[PDB]
Design a protein around this ligand. Structure first.
Ligand SMILES: *[C@@H]1O[C@H](CO[C@H]2O[C@@H](C)[C@@H](O)[C@@H](O)[C@@H]2O)[C@@H](O[C@@H]2O[C@H](CO)[C@@H](O)[C@H](O)[C@H]2NC(C)=O)[C@H](O)[C@H]1NC(C)=O
Ligand SMILES: *[C@@H]1O[C@H](CO[C@H]2O[C@@H](C)[C@@H](O)[C@@H](O)[C@@H]2O)[C@@H](O[C@@H]2O[C@H](CO)[C@@H](O)[C@H](O)[C@H]2NC(C)=O)[C@H](O)[C@H]1NC(C)=O
Ligand SMILES: *[C@@H]1O[C@H](CO[C@H]2O[C@@H](C)[C@@H](O)[C@@H](O)[C@@H]2O)[C@@H](O[C@@H]2O[C@H](CO)[C@@H](O)[C@H](O)[C@H]2NC(C)=O)[C@H](O)[C@H]1NC(C)=O
Ligand SMILES: *[C@H]1O[C@H](CO[C@H]2O[C@@H](C)[C@@H](O)[C@@H](O)[C@@H]2O)[C@@H](O[C@@H]2O[C@H](CO)[C@@H](O)[C@H](O)[C@H]2NC(C)=O)[C@H](O)[C@H]1NC(C)=O
Ligand SMILES: *[C@H]1O[C@H](CO[C@H]2O[C@@H](C)[C@@H](O)[C@@H](O)[C@@H]2O)[C@@H](O[C@@H]2O[C@H](CO)[C@@H](O)[C@H](O)[C@H]2NC(C)=O)[C@H](O)[C@H]1NC(C)=O
Ligand SMILES: *[C@H]1O[C@H](CO[C@H]2O[C@@H](C)[C@@H](O)[C@@H](O)[C@@H]2O)[C@@H](O[C@@H]2O[C@H](CO)[C@@H](O)[C@H](O)[C@H]2NC(C)=O)[C@H](O)[C@H]1NC(C)=O
Ligand SMILES: *[C@@H]1O[C@H](CO)[C@@H](O)[C@H](O)[C@H]1NC(C)=O
Ligand SMILES: *[C@@H]1O[C@H](CO)[C@@H](O)[C@H](O)[C@H]1NC(C)=O
Ligand SMILES: *[C@@H]1O[C@H](CO)[C@@H](O)[C@H](O)[C@H]1NC(C)=O
Ligand SMILES: *[C@@H]1O[C@H](CO)[C@@H](O)[C@H](O)[C@H]1NC(C)=O
Ligand SMILES: *[C@@H]1O[C@H](CO)[C@@H](O)[C@H](O)[C@H]1NC(C)=O
Ligand SMILES: *[C@@H]1O[C@H](CO)[C@@H](O)[C@H](O)[C@H]1NC(C)=O
Ligand SMILES: *[C@@H]1O[C@H](CO)[C@@H](O)[C@H](O)[C@H]1NC(C)=O
Ligand SMILES: *[C@@H]1O[C@H](CO)[C@@H](O)[C@H](O)[C@H]1NC(C)=O
Ligand SMILES: *[C@@H]1O[C@H](CO)[C@@H](O)[C@H](O)[C@H]1NC(C)=O
Ligand SMILES: *[C@@H]1O[C@H](CO)[C@@H](O)[C@H](O)[C@H]1NC(C)=O
Ligand SMILES: *[C@@H]1O[C@H](CO)[C@@H](O)[C@H](O)[C@H]1NC(C)=O
Ligand SMILES: *[C@@H]1O[C@H](CO)[C@@H](O)[C@H](O)[C@H]1NC(C)=O
Ligand SMILES: [Cl-]
Ligand SMILES: [Cl-]
Ligand SMILES: [Cl-]
Ligand SMILES: [Cl-]
Ligand SMILES: [Cl-]
Ligand SMILES: [Cl-]
Ligand SMILES: [K+]
Ligand code: NA
Ligand code: NA
Ligand code: NA
Lengths: 527, 527, 527
């Protein structure tokens, strides 16, 4: 029986057997008042205290969200859907600690992605018990509000100020600062890690002055806030909140009255209307996301980044080889997960209209010009591959590389990786390659479980990544020092060294996607 | 009559006449609860306070340990045996201060070696009264638990957590921080110094976060924790504790019950079985030594060293010219202290099987290949010398040089020496050369006593070493500034300058044992 | 009526008219218990408090000292004799402040020289009213005990521990830290300045840990503690205290009894015997001076200097062109202030025996070899000039340059000057040139008084020196910025730039006395 006294009252955890050892899991500890009734769309309010023992022995409710129903019955998409009940009452977090209880362990805090519209901390691929067992770190993860309920903004109105889900994340970081030592953790050694919108969130904690003293360092897997889907302008945010009011019968002349009417709607009516607040969207649309609220975020984040106004610390950033392919089967014409998706030039063109809907004809022709000068045979897959690369370079890889360059120019060590291993169990088809999201299970150590039929080469790859990530959290340096491994060099402007992650051989390379990123970074923003 | 008020009560010392002056010695002050009954194998518990005056006028009990009986009646080995009664009640320390009492003197804290299995602070060659008299420093030394009683580990179980003897050392450092100012010492100027396992211990205090604020700088004579005998893996430590239980009738299903049964054994039954917890050992076997306990030591020490996770301060490190020869007469065939030990090739081969018992045939042939390409005459002593060098390079010299390189790469000044003077009184035979352990008496100033029949050249050598060591403790710089001495340069990666210590002429040289250390450091660990 | 409340009680000062303005002088404030009866030869004890107003309107008693009677009636020597009554009751200091009272003025604390045997703060040439008036700084000066009464040492015995007069200086610095703000001064901007033994004293405050927080920076005029007369070894100090006991009837077996008998002697009997505690002395003999006491001075000062163990701050150091000439008329044969002192080779030789009495024949021939290879005519004055240069290079100039090199190698800015102006009023004869002591009146601004018949060129020179010294105290940089002056460059090892001070033109030069100093610094100490 493991019972821990926190600042809000006692919590009871449970013992898990993991690889011949034990891990103690405390699943579903509350970290804020449930944001119901009058609290809907406000910043999270802090917890009052319980007398008695809170049983943290099962995952809590996931936050309200739309679900992906594009492939019912299919593991490749269903594994990202929420696996506990959906509820507005969803502000909880999970703690995994080594047994015996550690003395001052480094803490890894995971922030899930999902476009800021979806996601939950309870998915199988985010289970922190392997990292706790193998590296003797404490792993923490939280649920945070998503969609309009997390990110609706009428900027400057404290009834719906924006960024509520980022404030939920921040309050969970505060919870670790105040309580993690009772679990054996060191509040002075806390690394954030997250993937896609979870990575963009981590990068915004580097910018937010209220997060500055709540963590030590940061890991960004496939995402950063300069990615084109990550931050909503003030103008589109007010537009979208007003469209949402229109669609739900809540248009009013007084803005505080709009919010009060939105607070009377059942969650389902809000969720049903979210897709439509925008005149056209894409597979990557973030309808309700982070905004410049003058609170969490004090200025446009591209200005803060450019002028060095962010926490000075080490970062670990990287991307997967085929980031853009997952998105093509959610609307590009000619694509299917159930065939080889060979498309024509005309299809490629229609595909750019799907992913770049507000963009000029010239802008879309510029994309086609840059990506279709082929090397070289008339390969059938030319256009299929070009579209996946357009979408992955624009939305993920070039923005991660630009973020890492700009961050590292202010004097801190940064380490960049390119993940290029396709999981032997991947249920999506071969043409999609090394997809977005599919490094996560290697990071959390799932291939360390021999019972699961990953290959031996994947066990070794995951074991090495897990060690590099734990060394980065503990020591700021993501080396694997014992097994004659390739040394991971810092990423600097000028040389731009990165490390490739694969089952065969790790290589130091330079200037990832140089010619493509010059296009997206220096030309495309003009268009 | 000198009486000093400490935080635990009054202590009475005694006056010694040393070289026409006086030194005050306080021998045998307790610094912890005697670790008896239920405290056996636990961390040391702090002292409660005595009313009345503790008489610190004789050396205290040495900790329980096996004794070297290989050469009864022979000074060369008997001088390292304990010279006070053996007892589990042995947690005491000694303080030597100058008279008149100094104002804010620098403090040197000696940690004895002995493989972590043997040793005591009361040996003649560790008598701190000469350093106190000549350099006006305070010298402190402690007894710490050795063998299973100091280092038994069931890792993570606080009944036998491991590293107890390192925690004994640490508590004695805490005792100096809290009490040394009452003796005239400066707690902000404390240098640790130790030899062999005492040096490895000092290097682990550089790694341990709980020792960080307990000392200023460090001196490592013939030892460091990366030496192959210095740290036991978790796996061999549990194996050995379980073998010990088996041999004493204490095997149980519940681990806490194993410990409780071990607590009922008389010390002698424990000591008698220590040699046997391992299927074969060598003259250098450390059956119960430091382990990674998650407390004193938070991670494998090679990782901490490599990634710069250690106290940033100056170090003084060095080795003796013939470190490995002392060990050859404790089991290598053909060797004897009573003849010239000329051995054959076959003997050399059998000798590698004695010192490298778990090592593959290929591994042992690699040693022979590297050390027997002779320059050049068919000298009878070729194989005798090669074996002493194998054992001294592998176990002491290459690991001290690698430790000093890796430490100095993080920006701190380090100074390396090579001691090459053989004492004119050495009772071992000439072929053993400048043996392991035989710089100690020069460091503590024993040749300054003219009554003892060292030569005049040895008086001057010791006087110069004593001054360099005191200057290093006081000022971080081991110069002898007044007598046109060779200037001791910092040891850097790249140049690797070291200073030779001898009676004739001091030289600055570079890259000590370069070709040999490349073998032991970059190749042998693979084998 | 100006009355100031200090921590010990009220003091009343007096108003002076200086150059059409007013200065407030508080002359003779006590800063310690009078060191009489049982306090004779002990460290100064702090003051108890007076109720009522202490009238600080006249200079206090000078400390007991022998007087220079070599030239009665002659201003050149009499101006250095004490001008108030001699008394053991002499621990007082003087404060000059600008009117109106300043707000947070920089403070200059003057320490007089006199061989540690003589001197007083009340001499005309140390009158601080000109500096207070012209630069609006506060000037402070103290009387400190000299001769045996200041410096008798039985090292380690607190009845006569040594360095009492340095402790008197230190207690006066403490007095300024605690009280100077009530006078309008800034305790965080305090520069020490002193000449000859006053400069050596200032250099020892840079070494003493108890002085470290009592001042900001330092000015050394003609003196430093590495000069050969400045620090007495432990062995000659005990010898001299024992000779003093012998000559006064005070030899005893118990050392504390020797001191008690010395405490019963009238001061005059002590003063009468001081010349004789040494078997031969010279014009530069310091019979009772600073020693290594383990309190004020924790180690030999050459070791501390060499290994960088001193306060890190800026220094201003310099010497006069003919430092050694003043001493030649106090015993070298053939010399007289009343004729041109042309001497022969034989006289030069006898002269070296007067100044280097314990030195070998070889040592004295080495001096003659180095200084008599003439460039070149057979000039009658060759030997007269060579002797003045021997004495000035050995005792003042080479040691000031070595001190400045060694100090500046640890990273701080130092500025060196060579003063080469002979005062138009100098009462000594022309052949003595720019004598020791005769920059002082330029530093304190005496030529600013037009009524005194210095030349116009001397008024301008003094005005520029006064500005450079005040800028150094206030800003750490001794520039004169307004009058197209030569910029004073920092003195570095390697280039060794210094600034010449004269009425004609200021020059930047390099490597002052290079060939001579190599002789005194690297060869002579061996002899
Ligand atoms: C690969 O599949 C796509 C996707 O559409 C299909 O899914 C298939 C596996 C199959 O079940 C099919 O019936 C289903 O419609 C094909 O594109 C589609 O082609 C149809 C029929 O010609 C068009 O009229 C559709 O609009 C188009 N759908 C979309 C979403 O674009 C595609 O041709 C096929 N590609 C191959 C076989 O290479
Ligand atoms: C040097 O001595 C060794 C050690 O053994 C011996 O000690 C000697 C000084 C002597 O008292 C001797 O009787 C005693 O055994 C010699 O090696 C030994 O040689 C013996 C006899 O041949 C072998 O059978 C032994 O096993 C072997 N002992 C060991 C421990 O190896 C050695 O030959 C001798 N060397 C010389 C003289 O050069
Ligand atoms: C310069 O004077 C010295 C000093 O001695 C003298 O002072 C003179 C000004 C004068 O009053 C004289 O009578 C007085 O003695 C002379 O040296 C002295 O010379 C005398 C006489 O020859 C020697 O016997 C002395 O010992 C010697 N005195 C000392 C202290 O050395 C010196 O010769 C004279 N030099 C000149 C004129 O160039
Ligand atoms: C935000 O403001 C209007 C909102 O128009 C919308 O009405 C909402 C309630 C919702 O249903 C939404 O789908 C609908 O579009 C946007 O006006 C659109 O602009 C288009 C031309 O592109 C016109 O056809 C309509 O006015 C309207 N769209 C449709 C499909 O009817 C406006 O574009 C937007 N602001 C932005 C994008 O900055
Ligand atoms: C640790 O575990 C076993 C322990 O075996 C041992 O039993 C102990 C009580 C003790 O007496 C010890 O001397 C004995 O060895 C080790 O097994 C050994 O392996 C050898 C082969 O090398 C076999 O012969 C036996 O099982 C046993 N040795 C002997 C001499 O009988 C095991 O080697 C060890 N683990 C390690 C070294 O990692
Ligand atoms: C310190 O110790 C003795 C002290 O001798 C002295 O007796 C004193 C009371 C005093 O009067 C002093 O002038 C006298 O010298 C020194 O011994 C001297 O050494 C010389 C040889 O140089 C002998 O002639 C005598 O013993 C004595 N001098 C005289 C002139 O009579 C000793 O030199 C000294 N120690 C040092 C300098 O380190
Ligand atoms: C918490 O845990 C235990 C189950 O073992 C139970 O006794 C207690 O009532 C629980 N609280 C609940 C279910 O609310
Ligand atoms: C944990 O380590 C930190 C430094 O990272 C230290 O300040 C803190 O006090 C430690 N707490 C422990 C060991 O309980
Ligand atoms: C609008 O209504 C709110 C809600 O009660 C009220 O508090 C507010 O003062 C009104 N604001 C404006 C701008 O009319
Ligand atoms: C290093 O190698 C060992 C064995 O050679 C292996 O079992 C372990 O998984 C590796 N460790 C890491 C951190 O990759
Ligand atoms: C401590 O010292 C003195 C011996 O001189 C004695 O009077 C006192 O009893 C001693 N305490 C003991 C022996 O326990
Ligand atoms: C001893 O010196 C230290 C600096 O090393 C200082 O902080 C401390 O106060 C000193 N104590 C004394 C002289 O009593
Ligand atoms: C084993 O026995 C100990 C000793 O009393 C007891 O405290 C403990 O709870 C038991 N542990 C296990 C794992 O059975
Ligand atoms: C330096 O030399 C002196 C005498 O020349 C000698 O007596 C002393 O031992 C030496 N000191 C050191 C520190 O080696
Ligand atoms: C201090 O000063 C004034 C002189 O103007 C006087 O009234 C007072 O008595 C003096 N104290 C003395 C002389 O002790
Ligand atoms: C004097 O200036 C110092 C800095 O040199 C400052 O800390 C202090 O408070 C000042 N006091 C005043 C202006 O009264
Ligand atoms: C010598 O006499 C003093 C003076 O009273 C006394 O206090 C001291 O104890 C005695 N010291 C020695 C060493 O005899
Ligand atoms: C600078 O020059 C002026 C007039 O030209 C003069 O009166 C003053 O004395 C000079 N100041 C200094 C600080 O030398
Ligand atoms: Cl076209
Ligand atoms: Cl390149
Ligand atoms: Cl062979
Ligand atoms: Cl070299
Ligand atoms: Cl001659
Ligand atoms: Cl030059
Ligand atoms: K010479
Ligand atoms: Na479903
Ligand atoms: Na014995
Ligand atoms: Na007179």
């Amino acid at each position: 029986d493991i019972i821990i006294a926190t600042k809000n009252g006692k919590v009871r955890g449970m013992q898990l057997t993991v690889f011949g050892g034990t891990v103690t899991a405390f699943l579903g500890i509350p970290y804020a008042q449930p944001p119901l009734g009058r609290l809907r769309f406000k910043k999270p309010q802090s917890l009052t205290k319980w007398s008695d023992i809170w049983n943290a022995t099962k995952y809590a409710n996931s936050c309200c969200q739309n679900i992906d129903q594009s492939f019912p019955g299919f593991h490749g998409s269903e594994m990202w859907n929420p696996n506990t009940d959906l509820s507005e009452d969803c502000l909880y977090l999970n703690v995994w600690i080594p047994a015996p209880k550690p003395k001052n362990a480094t803490v890894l805090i995971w922030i899930y992605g999902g476009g800021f519209q979806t996601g939950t901390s309870s998915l199988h691929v985010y289970d922190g018990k392997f990292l706790a067992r193998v590296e003797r770190v404490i792993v923490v993860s939280m649920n945070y509000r998503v969609g309009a309920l997390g990110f609706l903004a009428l900027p400057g109105n404290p009834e719906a100020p924006g960024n509520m889900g980022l404030f939920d994340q921040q309050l969970a970081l505060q919870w670790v600062q105040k309580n993690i030592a009772a679990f054996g953790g060191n509040p002075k050694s806390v690394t954030l890690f997250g993937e896609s919108a979870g990575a963009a969130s981590v990068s915004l904690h580097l910018l937010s002055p209220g997060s500055h003293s709540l963590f030590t360092r940061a890991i960004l897997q496939s995402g950063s806030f300069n990615a084109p889907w990550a931050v909503t302008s003030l103008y589109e945010a007010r537009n979208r909140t007003l469209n949402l009011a229109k669609l739900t019968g809540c248009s009013r002349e007084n803005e505080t009255e709009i919010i009060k009417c939105l607070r009377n709607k059942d969650p389902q009516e809000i969720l049903l209307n979210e897709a439509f607040v925008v005149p056209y969207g894409t597979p990557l649309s973030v309808n309700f996301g982070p905004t410049v609220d003058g609170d969490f975020l004090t200025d446009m984040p591209d200005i803060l980044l450019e002028l060095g106004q962010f926490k000075k610390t080490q970062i670990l950033v990287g991307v997967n080889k085929d980031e853009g392919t997952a998105f093509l089967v959610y609307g590009a014409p000619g694509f299917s997960k159930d065939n080889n998706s060979i498309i024509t030039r005309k299809e490629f063109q229609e595909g750019l209209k799907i992913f770049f809907p507000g963009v000029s004809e010239f802008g879309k022709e510029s994309i086609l010009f840059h990506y279709t000068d082929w090397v070289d045979d008339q390969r059938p897959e030319n256009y299929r591959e070009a579209l996946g690369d357009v979408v992955g370079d624009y939305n993920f890889i070039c923005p991660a590389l630009e973020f890492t360059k700009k961050f590292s120019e202010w004097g801190n060590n940064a380490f960049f990786y390119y993940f290029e291993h396709r999981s032997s169990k991947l249920p999506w088809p071969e043409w999609m390659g090394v997809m977005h999201g599919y490094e996560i299970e290697f990071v959390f150590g799932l291939p360390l479980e021999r019972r699961d039929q990953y290959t031996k080469a994947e066990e070794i790859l995951s074991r090495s990544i897990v060690k590099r990530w734990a060394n980065f959290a503990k020591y700021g340096n993501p080396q694997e020092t014992q097994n004659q491994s390739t040394s991971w060099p810092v990423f600097k402007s000028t040389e731009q060294k990165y490390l490739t992650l694969n089952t065969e051989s790790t290589r130091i390379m330079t200037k990832l996607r140089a010619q493509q990123c010059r296009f997206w970074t220096s030309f495309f923003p003009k268009v």
